[model samples]
Target: AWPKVQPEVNIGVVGHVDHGKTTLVQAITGIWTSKHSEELKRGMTIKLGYAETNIGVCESCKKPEAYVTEPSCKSCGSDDEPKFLRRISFIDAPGHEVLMATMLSGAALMDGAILVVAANEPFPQPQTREHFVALGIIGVKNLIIVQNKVDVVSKEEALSQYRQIKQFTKGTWAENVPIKPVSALHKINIDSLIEGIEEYIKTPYRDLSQKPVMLVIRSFDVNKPGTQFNELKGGVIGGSIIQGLFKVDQEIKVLPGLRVEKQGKVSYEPIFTKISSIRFGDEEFKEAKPGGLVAIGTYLDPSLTKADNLLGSIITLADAEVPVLWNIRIKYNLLERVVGAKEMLKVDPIRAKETLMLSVGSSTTLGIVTSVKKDEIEVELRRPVAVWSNNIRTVISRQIAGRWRMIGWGLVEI
Candidate 1:
């Protein structure tokens, strides 16, 4: 389905639950599993999704983060290492309202996005509209739509579902996006998603007039065939190229480790800096292009790249920006998804661990009630998120359990 492009580019997957967001990503990446161990045990990506994108190098930092190591970070090694191409970073998000905050945090840096909708659902549910709205706010330019589950619905039903989608998208980011109907379970129309990807995103960018630098998305200290025991010196870099060329023997700094997530909201913007040189297995390229994907060696401990987040030279056509307080004053819909952080007299405590999927302007996140302030409940995230200040709608859901259950909701303070 997806050929695994260069490593720096970031692509997102979004949709209502059961709409094929997870299944579709697996289809393209050739690995049918994106679930973390806990996720597999639970049967859903309750927290995060992983995929690699192609990237280029930076002109100043003489280091390169291209398509060499393909894990989650610079020292690319995973116990369950899947042989996905080093090129391509995928951000998989939960579509329910509870996770809206988490989605926004991930959306802030996406280079492209794919909105998945179920053909069987008659109307575009609020979550569908919410995801679309977030895309519009962030201005995600590289876009594609998935009309999933077409096998279950009649062609007319699918068309009608798409028509409703068109009705909401006539003047939005999805105006001309090719709507490809797919069935991730059956693998139908999956090739079209790849074709749409190739056709819609083909502006390969390159500039040879700079240094070779890359960001550190994920890293690892491995015990491979060549590396020695009692000696800890193996690393993998999962990032995109920003400028010049990156190769083997590149001395680089895997920056901001844990601090990466705490910097003024988007604390850990992935970028490789403070370099020495570049190298590959045994070959070396003096320069790699802006759209080139790669991974490399670094001076930092591999554990710092747990987020697998890295930066690239290519800015998203939408240039996803941080959300602001908007005109919307939102509340929870009876059927929206939400995760109860604290046991309240009204909220179903047993379902607190259940993740909520929320939609604010152009972002979605899994929100757990961090604190219940009298008119303002502070919804906190496992990750910091972006959202419009005033309007935020929430809902209750037991995904894989059934339809959404509505919990009381509130607005985000400016």
Candidate 2:
């Protein structure tokens, strides 16, 4: 019964590097997200990690103390059945500067976010500031700040950290947001954190009438080496559906799929396949709706999907019509200052022939500016992307001091 339960929302765990985002996730979900070998070797999250857990509350207990992730409430040891709240999936985004693109891609799938800050460190680390600004650029309105590592800090230090955080967010979108303190490593004050999530991160209304569309964040071959031919599995793609529903055996098309090169010419071809299976965590579902992370098994050759080959692609119903864009004109806005940099630097206007990194949905691509108007810019993409909506938000970044720094955002002028 638990395996088949589908999560109702995606909550992103994002913040500065080594702020214990993954540890908080593990404390809440009882599952470690950093399963990749490289992630284990480095002791930091390199890619987006995913985990899911059920949130429940006991009626017999008081507020905050009533919230629990377990099957039964432990606070009151109540024999009465706890009321079940919705299950939630957590997208644990990397906080390292180099993995900003990966974090942006993960941000596309988030319905809300938990911004973690270590209480022992100075408030608003470089990446912390960057991640918060990125969330604003992406238009994620639901937010909660978690002051973690409280156990490592003195009470005065923790209070000082809180004061700094308050000062940092006083005039921003998160000015009125709730900030909860906890020790994620010791699992202290987690109940209050869960209560905060329940209060602030309510799932928004989804339009099920629209055609099914999913952004491909992760794609890989599920088969292990030396497997029997008969036992081989098809490629699997994992992402969150934004609209409509998908069913097993439904015909699907992946846009801007594979890159083809021939005699100095390059093109992208769409991949068509049937959905072999649909899964949420270990649960197999005949159909999936908009919410949470889902895995879709397809009949495509495994090699095409190995090592995230199909990542950043769009998946939709075979009959759905979507545009494949190679060149785009955007109504852009430049931020007053560049984010993710140690020093605040004023953003310069976009110039013709300047190369900029653009993040659309889960995809990241480089574009060369072809034209720039007062508030509009035209760019020719190095790689084509499938546009599912007319007014998609595109986050723009420019190279500064040897690293890509987020500077602005734009809306697709369709």
Candidate 3:
């Protein structure tokens, strides 16, 4: 049916809004994640979508396959395991404070991160600085600095911004990371940018012959009565091949289902690999394992695959636990902090000082914070929450002024 390729790295992306996170992925993978109708016309993203680019070459013939950076080991045929040349997966997070909680959730899915900044804009925009700061706090090690949108200004201005980044990122792990200047809209410097990524992909070498695991990001009931008379009619889906050999007709356990968004718009298809396929940007692979990106076969519509939705095998029942409750901290709404069962009906940064509503992972709760403080506060859900969470995050909403309108958000945890 199709070939399977193992991935080399899973890189997450962070930056201020309009910093070109989606554009960079489009350039790399040939798939657009943020090109929604509103995003295209306004040049801004509205929500999350999933789309990826492959690089590298075929493992057997040694050739470039798709937008990935890794290579395959065998031709398009044969069940022989194939490896990803540049099996890279990307995660895009919102930049506004109102979405900080969402950003925290997005960051958790990444093993490493890449920071994007406008080469012409001032160094570390409000959210940019905070995101960088958050990365450090989260113990994220690998960092890539992308000086994007350089085509709009002179090289001097671009370098000046780069200097600002250098100064701000000096002590952080990102400081040592290479800075790639590119015009995401112009495609300038993209090649060098990719070359840099080729060098940065973290190589995880381990004994082959281990059981593989995968995290599901999307799941759905396909071929149901709406389209075709289906059987049980549902399946879990995701992009990473965790560990062990995942082959057709084999029942491998898919653990710790992953939640993912489109991050952009994409037309996805389930590949039926009748033959074993493998290839990345440069590296030839015979089998894929942990840390690589993949799309398990599923006949589900891509539109329903919303952000934070999980998919995977029915196995790992105990490990598939969700956060049903949390004590979240919301800040920066009032000149002075107001802590209560403040509702976040809306999480819009543009609208100021208005109560809005939103949900976490999947559950949209009407709850209140059990306590409050300057930096971190504890929240009690009117109802319990079932999502993944940790310390060092904030979720802020407003409950003042006229009708409730979303204003902004801050750190989600203490």
Candidate 4:
């Protein structure tokens, strides 16, 4: 029902839970992200939510409309052909402290981000601070500040909160960044917010000559239990393309694909499959380019991809050489204090045999410190990971209060 394909760009919406991150995204995309039953019951986001919208501008007003799956403008009531700007894929990251890993996983796919802060609350909530640090650690440079829930607050209160926000971000990269006052729930000043997104989050340059790389965020079987043959659809792999391009019928390889156990030892073998189809939104495409989320269908067994079991796996051209990492030796750094912890204390140094939570490209694994050198540590993970480069950004977390609290990150040393 929409355009055939908009140049896909990934944007993340992040902030403290209940501060209207979900509401802000809903206002922009017109899609409610928290559809999971558990999330509905808990009233919180447990996994990443995604939606796509085409940014449009009203010719009469000369203002951005953020064509949110609707054909006409909500502001000017104009059905005239709205100027299409860009197609955006929004990653709605969870804002709760326990869901930091899930949020980080979503961050792996984001090119830029919008930080939502409720105008009703004081500045710098715990999750807000943690998310700010997380964005800095993940290297998300493009940012937009949404001071949300303004309709509920008085003008003076909103201004006070804005001042507090300015003071809070005085020395950070977000300092002097554009901040837009909005009421996401009421859809007030939404067009201005759309303009802010359009101006702040520019699509990055993509290289089509390089070999394609994709990190699988979620994979699943689209068939029901009673489905019959001939009408059965194949397994679907959904994620963002990091580089290059993919076309229908192209052969691909997924690393750490299938689990095998022999002689009390477990290992993985790469799965070779042919692409059956490619899809973006409701439209099917013969080719998919980088910078947007894509779902590739293959003829592999449904069981191999069911229940998001294949997440954290890598998919590339068949026979393309990829890094098979069994252990990681990292020259790491530690945070002075852990983020998202109730008690703030100095972070202890890594010791031998200590178990730590390791986050690499949206995949979380438990790693035991096999040995520790003066400046580096060798961790033998219970599960293996595939690295795209010699030095990749990896997050290190420690178990605090039975929750994995983020401590620091390090480079994956060769």
For model 2, the run of ten residues with the poorest summed lDDT: 1-10
Model 3: lDDT of residue 149: 89
Local accuracy of candidate 3 as per-residue lDDT tens digits, 1-414: 123444455677777877888888777666676645766797665444444455553345422221224343333553444444444667666655555545544554456777889876666675676567556655555777888888888988888887787788787567677888887887776756665666664655644464343444434333444554434333434444434545443333332223333765322222221212322323345544556444443333333343325432222223334333434455433222221113323232323222234333322334454555544345555433333334323333444433222233444443
lDDT on C-alpha atoms for all candidate structures: 0.50, 0.90, 0.51, 0.83
List where candidate 3 sits over 4 angstroms from the true fold: 1-3, 35-43, 57-84, 204-217, 221-225, 235-289, 292-315, 318-379, 382-414
Candidate order, TM-score descending: 2, 4, 3, 1
Candidate 4 steric clashes: 0
**Any runs in candidate 4 off by more than 4 Å, and if so which?**
60-74, 77-79
The Cα error of candidate 1 at residue 408, in Å, is 22
TM-score of each: 0.54, 0.98, 0.59, 0.94
The better-scoring model by lDDT among 3 and 4 is 4
Model 3 lDDT at residue 95: 59
Which candidate achieves the best TM-score against the true structure? 2
Q: Which ranges in model 2 have alpha carbons more than 4 Å from their true place?
A: 1-3
lDDT of 1 by residue, 1-414 (tens): 223333445677887766778888777675543445767786666654665433222222212221223333323332332334326556677776665555554554456788888887755665565566555555666878888889998888888877877776788656787788889888776545655665675544556554443432234444455645556443445444444555444434332223343555655342333332333323334533444234454444444433343321121112223342212223332312332221222344323334554443233345564443334444445444334123433322334334333344444545
Q: Say what the RMSD of model 2 is.
A: 1.2
List, residue by residue over 230-341, the lDDT tens digit for candidate 2.
9889999988898888999999999988888898899999999999999998888999887788999999888888888887998999989999999999999999888688
Please list the Cα RMSD from the true structure of every candidate, rounded to 1 decimal place: 13.0, 1.2, 10.6, 2.1
Candidate 3 residue-wise lDDT at 51? 45
**Per-candidate count of clashing residue pairs (backbone under 3 Å):** 105, 0, 91, 0
Ten consecutive residues with minimal summed lDDT in candidate 1? 311-320
lDDT at residue 87 of model 2 (Cα atoms): 89
Q: Give the Å error, residue 392, model 1.
A: 24
